[PDB]
Design a protein around this nucleic acid. Structure first.
Ligand SMILES: [Mg+2]
Lengths: 304, 88, 101, 128, 557, 198, 49, 132
RNA sequence: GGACCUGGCGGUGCUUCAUCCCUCUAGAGGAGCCUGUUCUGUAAUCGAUAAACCCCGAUCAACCUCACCACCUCUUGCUCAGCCUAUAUACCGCCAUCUUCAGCAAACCCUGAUGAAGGCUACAAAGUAAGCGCAAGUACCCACGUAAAGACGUUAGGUCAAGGUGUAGCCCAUGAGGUGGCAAGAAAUGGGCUACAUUUUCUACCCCAGAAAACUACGAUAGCCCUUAUGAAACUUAAGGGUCGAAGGUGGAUUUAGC
């Protein structure tokens, strides 16, 4: 209940003061981050679930935001859309519809739509898939319409940033170069590409033609420079370790491409990315499962 | 305590093993368990025997349960008299 | 008060092996070599054969220490697979967790 | 073996066969059946065959203002105590067995006319 | 030593003592089972070896009748086995040394042949005892042989026999040890009832005998001297000072026991300002800033007596000095057993409450209770009196809660004192509400008393105070309900209670309430009831029925 | 009917915000909810629920809490223990000077584990290390010593490493390492006739 | 040492300081069976002859 | 169907604590181990002895506090110390609790040759994490 | 007997699906051997045994293990006895199977006149707040994937031989101990290994080589012999060497696995 929440808030304030005393810091400037660090130090827990570790947050966060009963002592609900059972969702829809009406009166890249779980957390109300789809359609109709700054801010409450994903150094002799790293399977490589050179690659201190006898590995090495037409114009010193011949070739290729990105133009960097020369390959060996011959092959189902 | 100290984390070791699931037959069904061993190496440099003993006692008496410790001590020594000059 | 008579037999075998281990080691060292004369080695063979049968370490079986199960025993914990699973799945064994990777 | 023993709950679950296909189906007639009993109904901590009196556990810690010492009941009084425990268990079982009849409905094997008491009370001061 | 859990934290001194005794009983039971079944605990898996966790044996190994077997039984303190071994040795004629028989005499005389007490299996000197029998059977006797018997006789209060054996030793021209001298001092003092000067001369003569024998005395000598001279009090006061001066001159530094004995000697009903004040002040000046050490078995009772006189003299500064001396170094370990510690802290807190500012008094209350001890109802009453003197009644509710923590919930004296202090005066509505809540809690405690085996006893003053507090808080309905308790248990309602009830009724204009008050007062036949009746006609708008009832009740005047 | 004991309110209520925490927890002790004045919650919450409160929370009881090692407590403990420390020689500023003055390094290991038995065989191993450059040898003695030691000498690091593990105690292994170094040095400085067959 | 463990627990149960629930269940079943008529005969007295 | 250490839902009324509620695959994920000792770490030894000791301690404590235990024990080991942390219902008078604490501590200390401490936390009733 | 409801079924209609079929790769089905089962034999275990038995309980049998057999021995016995004696069709415990599922079960509410029964439409028309499962979260290298998880229920599914236990039975024996012993192929079948080679074989090397290449080829981890390792015990097990160079020449219907 509300009185319970008030008591929890008072207890949290007292506990915050006590924790500040315990860690020897100013209670007046003991932020939530300090509280979390102190709790993690005093009550260490290796449990992988972060929600299972000890927590002493504010009651506004520990307790669900569904709040106590939505009516006072008289029993009158606070919200006028309470009897809809989804007062948050329908209030939001009503506000969006009012915004659309006002837009009628007056007259993509780094963001995505929050998932249904995120919206449910926002409104602390359970919602159906079709309800979420209807709200998304309304929001997208709002966006497509000539939305103003206020509507853009309203949408940004639901926009979620998309997860889309170089230095130049000088040696002791003033040779401008770039250094980068790459991984492929188990092989790990570190490459150094100099700004000016005459196409000489030394792998582990050994020339590539003597270190990579297979023509395929040399072709993989040639791929980045040949893509940007810079064959024979750069000097590369790279060291690779682990894996086999092809894994090492791929790791060196990725490291060389990433390092060479420091010299080619931004459009050339984008072209290299679109060619796949910069994406770290996540294809790694899959573990063998018990009761099976291999990663995916089952044992021969016995003849019947 | 005025002791130079450095910290690093050696790579963990995850020992895994497999057991038959059912008490009888059903060989194709197993349960796999593991025992993760996480490490932390503290290197303390250039401290005397008394300070080393005090610090080791302090950190060992407070060692949390479930955490083992392996302290390696590099004892500086002088050449014995027999080795400073040849007896021959 | 052991789990079964087989566990009792194993305990007796272990005790006798511990009792006779020094003499068995000495006689085997007398045997497993080529330095000593052949007649002495044959006498040592006869003597070690004359020793009680249960003193031989090969007769010791690593049964489970709680259910006397003679197979599926993890040597590090000396428990059968069933008992080890029962204890590990209840969290009563330190640091042992289900392996998922 | 001590390590092979189990708890009372597990033993009751195993012996009573409360679960399983037999309970669900009942193909195997169980007129000769077992019922759960509380083995710890009347057991007092610190009471056993040897009849020892441990101060502070089963006998008063301080008697006549002085701390009692470890004392063992005589064989006669210990036998009397064991017999009294047996008789108390028998009395508890007898009281468990006794019950009270009810009033039949329209006929001795028909539910019609049998009263069910008042309806369950409502959530907020709404009783019947 | 207790468990830091709300359900297992002791809530009284009695509960504290009982919990500690129960824990010790559990430890004793465990030790008994360990000793009874050693084969279940012989598997030693500890590295390094831990001897104190191994089972202990109580069976002699040397079974053949020999001197080694006798010494083994003496070390094992098996009195019956030792006596049987000596008898068999004497009958068989096998060799025994003077030292072995001396050790046997030590074992027998120290216990006085009384069998030692284990977990399970006045002149206490028995007239029929084997110690004197073996001493007679002893062919060779030395200084130690006489000394052990004398010490055993004195320990068992066989003073006459000890003096006779000392006379025998003197005739044999042996030199008694200092312990024998102390035992003889005790025997000489306790043997006969004489004036102080006779015992004083006897003690000086024994000391001169020791000087002639060249034996140098110890702390135990003067300690026993003072302990035995404690009877004469005023007679031995100055001679005790002479003994202390002699101790200082010799260099035998007095310990806590010596000062405690001097304190007990100088303690007597009368005027402590005469000499006792000088004694305690000089002792405190001497001992200030000195760390003590275990020197005498009676060193633990010093602080108890010191705080007793501190309370008696009403010198809070002296008590503070004593407490500081206790806190310095490891002197706190000399506070003594649980009873002595409780008495010491009780007297200290009583003195603090009596003679200190209420702020420092509350600081001391927080510091000591419950960490130091659990207060008694009298100490709580003293604290309440100090608070009332300071007029800091706002703490009074908290104290009651503290009382509920310390088991004084059902203490009638404390409850009545709290109620009288709260209801004595009228206070702002916040304090009045706090007092009403405290009174309601006290009433609830009265309803839940464990003395609920017969018709409950309700103190009249307590009921009046609770009703007055409730009325002054505006909770008149509870007072109206409680008015029936007076009639039920014949407890006279207070005159001020009736006055306040009538005032509230007149302000609220409730003639029925005034009629009820007059009915109660007439049931109790108080004279004030007459005025109440008049007041009901004088201050209230009275209906015809109520007026007729008042006229009829007027005949009771 | 016998009275039923009522549990007291926890003493965290009587605590003060500016008290001395190390007094409450001087030593390592299990998490006591009645003694920790913090509203800590642990446990995976149920749906539309909150993490379990500390009272009865077995999860918090499982955690090896560091409430007895707060920074204030650590600072006070170090201040107390400063009396026990001895200053390291300020002259030996770097490992170069350490090798210059102390050319023999002895490595040993102490293993700490939970259990009633403290014995551990791996603690008996002693590793002596010395730079041949720091020794006093000529060309012939160095060459003979290298052949004598075999794999124990790494020419890259110029460090001779003698590992003693055959004696039951660490002190015995250290004595054996010193003796082995002594005899190796003396034989290195000793020249045999058959050495002419090189 | 199963001897040590079992004997110690049995002795504690006899002393009343250890409530062996499993042994209590076994004793209850034994009493019921003895009432039913199932009892061990004396040695050397096998029913089959 | 997996059956290990799981409490199967029957009617939605049976109460279970936090540990009983969670299935074995939640160990080290949502619930820690009930015994902490260095036996199972890399290179360490005497794991079997510690496991046997833990099993015996759990059985002994369950049989010594009949019905008092409100949850599983926590067996912590620091050096040669041995802390048994238990959660107990407030059934018995504290005299019996203190007697049992002293008894169990002394007996276990003499039986395992290590200083055994017993820390009890009392609860009014078995803590209910959820109903099944 | 009339009408209706639910289910089953229809050589029942329509619609849409999946690895159901074709398509892709490598296998099995032919040979030898390893191993498992079955059968025979023997004085000589048991259990699993359609998918969901068949390198299964076993992460393992020369003695031990061992529960089998023959012979001999013991009787308060290691146990306040014991039993691997019967019953998985009394059970706990741990699992298989659909599940490579998404639903389940309570507590209510409503409709049908308060009949059995039924309860969905998103521009929504009576369903629903909670619980369990999926999901989410977590482990591994990510947000992907793989693990893990996977309710209720189905097959009286498997296990009384992990252990515990109900009932029943044994107690000079269905208990306990000792010595010795099986374990062979006339076979059938399941899985696996090695092959039948030239994208191969041998050597060097770890991918720029030289030879071999059909009766002195390819092809045995088989047989025979001799060492060696372990062990008290080895023609038994394993490793190595020698010797032998066998069947076989890419294998039918059918069948397994993979994204
Ligand atoms: Mg009838």
């Amino acid at each position: 209940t509300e009185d319970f929440i008030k008591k929890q808030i008072e207890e949290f304030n007292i506990g915050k003061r006590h924790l500040a005393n315990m860690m020897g810091e100013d209670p007046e400037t003991f932020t939530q981050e300090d509280i979390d660090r102190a709790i993690a130090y005093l009550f260490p827990s290796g449990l992988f679930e972060k929600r299972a570790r000890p927590v002493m947050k504010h009651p506004e966060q520990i307790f669900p935001r569904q709040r106590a009963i939505q009516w006072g002592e008289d029993g009158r609900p606070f919200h006028y859309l309470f009897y809809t059972g989804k007062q948050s969702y329908y209030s939001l829809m009503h506000d969006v519809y009012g915004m659309l009406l006002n837009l009628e009166k007056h007259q993509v890249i780094g963001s995505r739509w929050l998932i249904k779980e995120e919206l449910e957390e926002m409104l602390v109300e359970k919602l159906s898939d079709l309800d979420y789809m209807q709200f998304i359609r309304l929001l997208e109709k709002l966006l497509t319409s000539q939305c103003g700054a206020a509507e853009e801010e309203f949408v940004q409450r639901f926009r979620r940033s998309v997860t889309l994903e170089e230095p130049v150094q000088y040696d002791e002799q003033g040779m401008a170069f770039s250094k980068s790293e790459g991984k492929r399977k188990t092989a790990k490589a570190e490459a150094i590409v100099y700004k000016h050179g005459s196409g000489r690659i030394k792998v582990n201190g050994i020339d590539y033609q003597l270190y990579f006898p297979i023509t395929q590995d040399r072709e993989q090495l040639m791929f980045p420079f040949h893509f940007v037409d810079r064959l024979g114009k750069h000097d590369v010193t790279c060291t690779v370790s682990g894996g086999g011949r092809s894994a090492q070739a791929g790791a060196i290729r990725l490291a060389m491409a990433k390092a060479l990105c420091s010299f080619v133009t931004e459009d050339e960097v984008e072209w290299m990315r679109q060619a796949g020369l910069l994406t770290t390959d996540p294809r790694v060996r899959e573990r063998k499962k018990p009761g099976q011959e291999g990663a995916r092959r089952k044992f021969t189902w016995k003849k019947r | 305590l005025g002791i130079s100290i450095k910290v690093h984390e050696p790579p963990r070791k995850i020992e895994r093993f497999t057991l038959l699931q059912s008490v009888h037959i059903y060989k194709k069904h197993r349960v796999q368990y593991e025992m993760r061993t996480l490490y932390r190496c503290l290197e303390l440099e250039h401290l005397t025997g008394s300070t080393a003993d005090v610090y080791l006692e302090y950190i060992q008496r407070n060692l949390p349960e479930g955490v083992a410790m392996e302290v390696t001590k590099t004892q500086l020594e002088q050449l014995p008299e027999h080795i400073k000059e040849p007896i021959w | 008060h052991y789990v079964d008579w087989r566990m009792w037999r194993d305990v007796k075998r272990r005790k006798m092996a511990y009792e006779y281990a020094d003499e068995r080691l000495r006689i085997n060292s007398l045997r497993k070599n080529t330095i000593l004369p052949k007649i002495l080695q044959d006498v040592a063979d006869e003597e070690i054969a004359a020793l009680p049968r249960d003193s031989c370490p090969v007769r010791i079986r690593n049964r489970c220490v709680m259910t006397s199960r003679p197979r599926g025993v993890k040597r590090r914990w000396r428990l059968s697979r069933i008992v080890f699973r029962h204890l590990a799945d209840h969290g009563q064994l330190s640091g042992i967790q289900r392996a998922t990777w | 073996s001590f390590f092979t023993k189990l708890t009372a709950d597990e033993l009751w679950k195993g012996a009573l066969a409360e679960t399983g296909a037999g309970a669900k189906k009942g193909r195997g007639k169980r007129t000769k059946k077992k019922k759960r009993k509380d083995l710890n109904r009347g057991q007092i901590i610190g009471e056993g065959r040897y009849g020892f009196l441990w101060p502070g556990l089963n006998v008063p810690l301080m008697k006549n203002g002085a701390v009692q010492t470890i004392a063992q009941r005589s064989k006669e009084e210990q036998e009397k105590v064991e017999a009294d425990m047996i008789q108390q268990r028998e009395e508890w079982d007898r009281k468990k067995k006794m019950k009270v009849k009810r009033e039949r409905g329209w006929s001795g094997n028909s539910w019609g006319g049998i009263s069910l008491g008042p309806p369950d009370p409502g959530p907020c001061g709404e009783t019947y | 030593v207790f468990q830091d859990d709300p359900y297992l934290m002791p809530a009284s001194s009695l509960e504290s003592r009982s919990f500690l005794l129960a824990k010790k009983s559990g430890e004793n039971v465990a030790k008994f089972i360990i000793n009874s079944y050693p084969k279940y605990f012989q598997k030693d898996i500890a590295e390094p070896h831990i001897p104190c966790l191994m089972p202990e044996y109580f069976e002699p190994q040397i079974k053949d009748i020999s001197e080694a077997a006798l010494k083994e039984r003496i070390e094992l303190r098996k009195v019956k086995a030792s006596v049987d071994m000596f008898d068999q040795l004497l009958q068989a004629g096998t060799t025994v040394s003077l030292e072995t028989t001396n050790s046997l005499l030590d074992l027998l005389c120290y216990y006085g042949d009384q069998e030692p007490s284990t977990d399970y299996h006045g002149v206490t000197w028995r007239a029929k005892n084997n110690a004197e029998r073996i001493f007679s059977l002893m062919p060779e006797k030395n200084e130690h042989s006489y000394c052990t018997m004398i010490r055993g006789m004195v320990k068992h209060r066989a003073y006459e026999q000890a003096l006779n054996l000392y006379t025998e030793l003197l005739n044999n021209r042996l030199h008694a040890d200092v312990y024998t001298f102390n035992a003889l001092i005790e025997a000489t003092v306790c043997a006969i009832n004489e004036k102080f000067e006779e015992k004083w001369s006897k003690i000086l003569e024994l000391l001169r005998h020791m000087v002639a024998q060249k034996v140098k005395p110890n702390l135990q000598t003067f300690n026993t001297i003072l302990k035995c001279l404690r009877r004469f009090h005023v007679f031995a006061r100055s001679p005790a000072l002479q003994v202390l001066r002699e101790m200082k001159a010799i260099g035998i530094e007095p310990s806590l026991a010596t000062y405690h004995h001097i304190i007990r000697l100088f303690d007597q009903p009368g005027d402590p300002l005469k000499r006792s004040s000088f004694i305690i002040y000089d002792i405190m000046n001497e001992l200030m800033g000195k760390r003590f050490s275990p020197k005498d078995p009676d060193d633990d009772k010093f602080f108890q007596s010191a705080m007793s006189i501190c309370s008696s003299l009403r010198d809070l500064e002296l008590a503070y000095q004593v407490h500081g001396l206790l806190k310095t170094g490891d002197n706190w370990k000399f506070i003594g057993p649980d009873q002595h510690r409780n008495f010491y802290y009780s007297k200290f807190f009583d003195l603090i409450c009596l003679m200190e500012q209420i702020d420092v008094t509350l600081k001391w209350y927080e510091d000591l209770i419950p960490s130091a001890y659990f207060p008694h109802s009298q100490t709580m009453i003293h604290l309440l009196q100090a608070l009332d003197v300071a007029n800091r009644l706002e703490v009074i509710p908290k104290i009651w809660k503290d009382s509920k923590e310390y088991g004084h919930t059902f203490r009638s004296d404390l409850r009545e004192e709290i109620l009288m202090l709260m209801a004595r005066d009228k206070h702002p509505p916040e304090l009045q509400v706090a007092f009403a809540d405290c009174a309601a809690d006290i009433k609830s405690a009265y309803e839940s008393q464990p003395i609920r085996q017969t018709a409950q006893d309700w103190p009249a003053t307590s009921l009046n105070c609770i009703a007055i507090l409730f009325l002054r808080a505006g909770r008149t309905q509870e007072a109206w309900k409680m008015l029936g308790l007076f009639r039920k248990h014949n407890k006279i309602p207070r005159s001020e209670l009736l006055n306040e009830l009538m005032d509230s009724a007149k302000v609220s204009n409730s003639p029925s309430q005034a009629i009820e008050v007059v009915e109660l007062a007439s049931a109790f036949s108080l004279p004030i009831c007459e005025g109440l009746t008049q007041r009901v006609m004088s201050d209230f708008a009275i209906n015809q029925e109520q007026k007729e009832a008042l006229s009829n009740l007027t005949a009771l005047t | 009917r016998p009275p039923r004991r009522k549990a007291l309110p926890p003493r965290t209520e009587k605590m003060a915000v500016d008290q001395d925490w190390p007094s409450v927890y001087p030593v390592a002790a299990p998490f006591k909810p009645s003694a920790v004045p913090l509203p800590v919650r642990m446990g995976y919450p149920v749906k539309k629920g909150v993490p379990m409160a500390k009272e009865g929370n077995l999860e918090l009881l499982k955690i090896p809490n560091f409430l007895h090692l707060t920074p204030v407590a650590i600072k006070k403990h170090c201040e107390a223990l400063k009396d026990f420390c001895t200053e390291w020689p300020a002259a030996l500023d770097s490992d170069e000077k350490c090798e210059k003055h102390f050319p023999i390094e002895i490595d040993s290991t102490d293993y700490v584990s939970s259990g009633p038995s403290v014995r551990n065989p791996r603690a008996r191993v002693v590793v002596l290390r010395v730079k041949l450059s720091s020794l006093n040898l000529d060309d012939h003695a160095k060459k003979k010593l290298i052949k004598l030691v075999g794999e124990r000498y790494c020419k890259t690091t110029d460090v001779l490493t003698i590992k003693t593990d055959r004696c039951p105690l660490r002190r015995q292994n250290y004595d054996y390492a010193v003796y082995l170094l002594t005899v190796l040095y003396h034989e290195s400085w000793n020249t045999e006739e058959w050495e002419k067959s090189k | 040492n199963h001897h040590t463990y079992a004997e110690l627990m049995q002795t504690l149960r006899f002393l009343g300081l250890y409530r062996d629930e499993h042994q209590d269940f076994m004793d209850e079943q034994k009493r019921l069976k003895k009432l039913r008529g199932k009892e061990k005969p004396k040695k050397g007295e096998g029913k089959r002859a | 169907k997996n059956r290990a250490a799981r409490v199967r839902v029957s009617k939605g009324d049976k109460p279970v604590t936090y540990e009983e509620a969670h299935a074995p695959h939640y160990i080290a994920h949502r619930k820690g181990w009930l015994s902490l000792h260095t036996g199972n770490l890399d290179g360490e030894d005497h794991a079997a002895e510690r496991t046997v000791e833990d099993v015996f301690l759990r059985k002994f404590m369950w049989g010594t506090f009949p019905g008092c235990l409100a949850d599983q024990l926590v067996l912590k080991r620091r050096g040669n110390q041995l802390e048994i942390c238990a959660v107990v219902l407030r059934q018995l008078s504290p005299h019996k609790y203190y007697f049992l604490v002293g008894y169990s501590e002394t007996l276990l200390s003499y039986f395992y040759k290590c200083p055994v401490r017993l820390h009890l936390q009392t609860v009014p009733s078995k803590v209910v994490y959820k109903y099944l």
